[PDB]
Design a protein around this ligand. Structure first.
Ligand SMILES: N[C@@H]1[C@H]2CN(c3nc4c(cc3F)c(=O)c(C(=O)O)cn4-c3ccc(F)cc3F)C[C@@H]12
Ligand SMILES: N[C@@H]1[C@H]2CN(c3nc4c(cc3F)c(=O)c(C(=O)O)cn4-c3ccc(F)cc3F)C[C@@H]12
Ligand SMILES: [Mg+2]
Ligand SMILES: [Mg+2]
Ligand SMILES: [Mg+2]
Ligand SMILES: [Mg+2]
Ligand SMILES: [Mg+2]
Ligand SMILES: [Mg+2]
Lengths: 482, 207, 482, 208
DNA sequence: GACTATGCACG
DNA sequence: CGTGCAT
DNA sequence: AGTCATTCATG
DNA sequence: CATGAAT
């Protein structure tokens, strides 16, 4: 009827439970594909549903309900918020979801509700899912035990660094800024070739973070420190220009701001400086950003010290902020603070896993087929005796048994022969089949070599990473300064 | 709720009355902040022909319009001190969109006649096909996505088609016959149900 | 540039639009299946997605998102609210959706949000959809032009009357009360035999409404009027009992209340009578209903006139109310005030079209099959000669020509022969095929007769209606008094 | 927020703290109204060992509990002026339910110790599987299979039979076994400082 | 995840 | 007022 | 259909 | 103070 537990024990089995889950299955990204579980399910469900960059947009509510019912047993609003986020290109260096409609602004006004919006996987998102149908990655049972879901994605690009993550669980938090796709891949390629590469050298390829919001990142040293240990504090500062206006008045013009910074709040807080006269000099503050440009104009009074003003805003507003690296991720089911090296190496180990898996799978298909084709060719040699045998067999089973026993076909071949349609009997061309037999024998040799030879395999993985870079490469947005 | 235009100017500034918060956002984003303001209407608007003038003054949607348009209401209404030269009604191009226009129009008629009488009240025509507004213009672009509402378009999409003063079209509501309009608004919006039922039976072809 | 337009003309056009749509496709039920468009789409969608009484509950949000993305372009909340209602057995005489979880209550407390609840079609909703896969009902394109939806369902029971409807559009409104399934079916069966039946005779089968909530209905005369003209006013009174209590005190107990009446509000309003002392003798009001029984206890004071109290409560609260029939429905695309006869007859006309369509569809399957089977029976006698004839042909098309030219098989028979799998040559059993032929000839004769004779078809309707009554009949809940 | 029991009775009245308005509905309907009250907590309870007593006093969820409990808070707390014999915490059988139980316990410990020291605080044990079973053990015998994701999934008639009915249910009765060994644990798991919590997690939680 | 206001007909 | 699909 | 408050780590 | 997945 009733049962006693101590306050000591009760607070253990409970916080233990929550702690574990929040760490493995909520707040922290997997080190390999760079996704938290909610994002993985969004991409996987959308992809299962054929909701891809090359097909019509699909109503958000439909995507969200499917995710909720099949994969992610939580609130629809959180799922949607996460979906929306992956579509905001001022928060993701490479957006994974393409969303038609009001998905928000840098001003942080609310996205249209899911009843109003439509969405689909972006083309690049496709590459995160590349080869998932080829048994390349481990699956688990969903919460319902009704369907299998992937525990990680194949990740044909290094999403963790490219898009970043953030980042608050229990006992742990995470902050990993986004990077330039091209730079990240260059490092990965160099590291495939030189596994023991040091950070200094890696940084000739991957010099630092690249925010979608651009701006200026300052502190080569703290960057080095973060790539080394996973923690570091760099400075991010707005891109500014001065503009002389008529009558001795100057004007400060902002064109880029720091990552994760809300434009409307920034502008307001700058205007608060003017209203409070915390510092003398400010005439007016204007947000002049339009549908195709970000432009904040801070007009100064005549004979006003524009150095003092700009310096004050840098210190007391978010015109300039500190950005703290705190690269934590899930490696081998546990949280790890990691620098650039573990990250790149975990990635490479993962691709290896995938490419091997991908290749075993394709090779198995080629084999099962080649095996059938070999039988068909043979059968043609003895058609009449084979039709007679089937004609004398009591049923499907008996016919297969007779095929094995009298002419040494295997089960798999027997089953293919016995389920041929009558019209096939009209064919007697062995050549076309022999051409297929040759094409398959070649494909199997290539695939077998990838699996048997570490270097052939690593070439493949370099070849593919370069194809991705050539396709999705965009220029740096953030400038680096020491 | 109101998103102001940057500068004040009773001669250029326009007031878009958008149906819904969500499209109010797409519109906040799409607009030209220097002269276009946005005011979202949350929910169906109160029928100012049916409800008591008390429940009316007390309605939050109505009060905030009387203030932002800024000229008072009804018999104490001075066109002179208004804030906008163009009040633009912008709804989904669906049936509930039509209803909202209806409701608003009978409010400007009843409580701000001078505004509608000077041709200051327009209606924005959003496109229905993706660009072409009329089925006719449709088949003509197939020689060379059916929009269910405003929320379907992106901000750059909104501006180009319906908010950009150069590229847009607007149904400008002029009162042609004072008598034949008073009767039309009443049969349709007033207390009495029978006449309305009859009007529908006469004018609406259920094919 | 702009385009001027009169107020007179604009207001006309616009309101004409909202008016029409609200009348045909939002507020009022179709006279045949008794559904509003949203209700139809909920059912069609759930059924297309295999979400039926005999299979697991599916999470509501998944049901709703699919409905919204494929058929109903409106708020998710409206869709969910409609779905919820269809599952409430205090608003529906025969619930069409089964919902697991907090789906509301007679106290009108809110149902759990769509993220929490699970649902599926009830077994009876099944009968509303029966035969929909058989080309028995007119389909239209959805707002996408991606998918066809049904404009009406095949309705294998008269849902308009059984579950009722209500009901507010433009210029029209509707209130139709629920009815006992058996009674409604008894009436319809009578009317099939006696098309010209008068209300008086119908009312021996269908005496009046049967509310889910039970209680007492007073007014044979107004019922007749309602059944005749679609309008009428009846009285609905709660089921009561007096319990004797210790110390000479008595107790009024309410066990059934009137349709569409919120039990919680009723109890406050009654307690208001006591608090205000509007009638002498009420000691205390308690709601004692629990998960398996409704119960309101009105404990009276010692020397209290229990009649004075009971009568007062009936008059000045909602322990007794008026119910007004205002039976309006959509009939040939237009709104119509209607009594029992137009309803029942419209239903019968609909079932006729549905059964005729069904029967045409099944006949055509059976002929096509009969035709194949006739050829197969022939092929058996010439098996070897056919195999040889195929062996001798250069390919598929050639094999068919040879079969046609040499043995006078038709195209469709040649196609079927030539595409048999080899193992079929072991299943060389003519008698089993002759049984199938016989069974098909019989089936085709029955269906021909349905198609060619109105009375034979009407008998099929009566037979089917009786099976539904046998299967779903339940006792009256509402008692009648005149 | 509170749905009260019909008759006021300190010796028998029960107070259900339910995680959520929706589940709080299933509880109103499922309950015996004579002596069982329902009080929905809307959202994660405030960590009373991390926030300032200022912000803790201004918390609606917290204030209505002191009010519905009726013994006031802190040192100005009489257990003799309480309104319930049993205060039952009823959360989903998921990780966030776990968390919520943890947050309420630290409140009832830091601010109503007497209530916890008198064995007056309990925790419902909702079922994990459905014949009904709690844990792997009871499923093996039932085999001789719906998995509950939350209180939301149970119809009000099941809720009663399985977890609200005094005659049919199981409750963990919370008890302070060692006041010292227990102060450390709440302070370490729920305290302001991260480093000790992180360590505790490292040492106790088995990631596998 | 509950709450807040409207339209529409009708007693 | 309160109903049920809408916004 | 926007809005309100809380966890958790962090500077 | 915010951040972003959670209730
Ligand atoms: N001046 C009025 C605002 C909106 N109110 C409600 N809105 C609801 C709803 C309920 C409301 F009280 C809904 O219930 C709803 C829905 O889709 O279910 C949508 N909405 C809804 C909300 C916002 C909007 F712009 C349009 C809507 F239809 C109250 C005050
Ligand atoms: N004392 C606080 C209640 C709840 N507050 C909010 N609740 C939100 C939310 C936001 C809130 F402010 C959500 O945003 C949300 C969601 O799923 O997105 C769920 N909820 C949510 C609401 C109720 C509940 F019981 C549990 C929840 F998680 C305000 C006052
Ligand atoms: Mg939320
Ligand atoms: Mg700063
Ligand atoms: Mg719309
Ligand atoms: Mg609503
Ligand atoms: Mg009465
Ligand atoms: Mg839960």
């Amino acid at each position: 009827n009733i049962q006693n537990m101590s306050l000591e024990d009760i607070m253990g089995e409970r916080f233990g439970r929550y702690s574990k889950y929040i760490i493995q299955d909520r707040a922290l990204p997997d080190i390999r594909d760079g996704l938290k579980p909610v994002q993985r399910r969004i991409l996987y469900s959308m992809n299962k549903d054929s909701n891809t960059f090359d097909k019509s947009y699909r109503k958000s509510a439909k995507s969200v309900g499917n995710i909720m019912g099949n994969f992610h047993p939580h609130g629809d609003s959180s799922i949607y918020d996460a979906m929306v986020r992956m579509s905001q290109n001022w928060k993701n260096r490479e957006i994974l979801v393409e969303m038609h409609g009001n998905n928000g602004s840098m001003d942080g006004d609310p996205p249209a509700a899911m009843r109003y919006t439509e969405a689909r996987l972006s083309e690049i998102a496709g590459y995160l899912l590349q080869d998932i149908e080829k048994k390349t990655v481990p699956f688990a049972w969903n919460f319902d035990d009704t369907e299998k879901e992937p525990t990680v994605l194949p990740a044909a690009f290094p999403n963790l660094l490219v898009n970043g993550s953030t980042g608050i669980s229990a006992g742990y938090a995470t902050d990993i800024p986004p990077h330039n796709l091209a730079e990240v891949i260059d490092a990965a390629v160099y590291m495939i070739d030189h596994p023991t590469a040091k950070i200094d050298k890696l940084m000739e390829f991957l010099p630092g973070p690249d925010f979608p919001t651009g701006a200026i990142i300052q502190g080569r040293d703290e960057i080095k420190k973060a790539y080394e240990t996973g923690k570091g504090r760099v400075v991010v500062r707005s891109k500014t220009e001065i503009e002389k206006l008529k009558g001795g008045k100057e004007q400060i013009v902002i064109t880029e701001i720091p990552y994760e910074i809300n434009k409307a709040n920034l502008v307001k807080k700058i205007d608060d400086v003017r209203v409070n006269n915390k510092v003398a000099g400010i005439a007016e503050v204007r947000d002049e950003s339009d549908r195709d440009g970000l432009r904040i104009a801070i007009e100064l009074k005549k004979d006003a010290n524009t150095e003092l003003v700009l310096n004050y805003l840098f210190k007391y507003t978010d015109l300039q902020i500190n950005y703290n690296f705190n690269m934590v991720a899930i490696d081998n089911f546990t949280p790890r603070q990691v620098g650039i090296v573990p990250i790149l190496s975990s990635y490479i180990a993962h691709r290896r896993e995938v490419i091997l898996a991908r290749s075993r799978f394709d090779k198995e298909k080629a084999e099962k087929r080649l095996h059938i084709v070999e039988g068909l060719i043979r059968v043609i040699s003895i058609l009449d005796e084979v039709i007679a045998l089937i004609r004398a067999s009591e049923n499907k089973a008996d016919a297969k048994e007779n095929l094995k026993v009298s002419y040494d076909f295997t089960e798999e071949q027997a089953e293919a022969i016995v389920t041929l349609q009558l019209y096939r009997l009209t064919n007697t061309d062995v050549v076309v089949l022999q051409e297929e037999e040759a094409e398959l024998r070649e494909k199997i040799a290539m695939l077998a070599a990838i699996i048997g030879d570490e270097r052939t395999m690593y070439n493949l993985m370099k070849k593919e990473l370069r194809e991705v870079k050539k396709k999705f490469a965009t220029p740096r947005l953030s400038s680096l300064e020491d | 709720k109101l998103t102001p235009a940057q500068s004040k100017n009773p001669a250029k500034n326009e007031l878009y009355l958008v149906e819904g918060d969500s499209a109010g956002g797409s519109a906040k984003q799409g607009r030209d902040r220097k002269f276009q303001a946005i005011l979202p209407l949350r929910g169906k608007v109160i029928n100012t022909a049916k409800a008591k003038m008390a429940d009316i003054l007390k309605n939050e949607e109505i009060n905030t319009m009387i203030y932002t348009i800024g000229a008072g209401v009804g018999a104490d209404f001075s066109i002179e001190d208004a804030n906008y030269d163009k009040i633009i009604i912008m709804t989904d191009a669906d049936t509930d969109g039509a209803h909202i226009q209806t409701l608003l129009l009978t409010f400007f008629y009843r409580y701000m006649r001078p505004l509608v009488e000077a041709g200051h009240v327009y209606i924005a025509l959003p496109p229905l096909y993706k660009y072409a507004w009329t089925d006719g213009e449709l088949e003509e672009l197939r020689k060379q996505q059916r929009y269910k509402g405003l929320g379907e378009m992106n901000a750059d999409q909104l501006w180009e088609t319906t908010m950009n003063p150069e590229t847009r079209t607007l149904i400008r509501v002029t009162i042609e016959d004072l008598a034949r309009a008073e009767r039309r608004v009443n049969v349709l919006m007033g207390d009495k149900v029978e006449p309305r039922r009859k009007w529908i039976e006469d004018n609406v072809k259920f094919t």
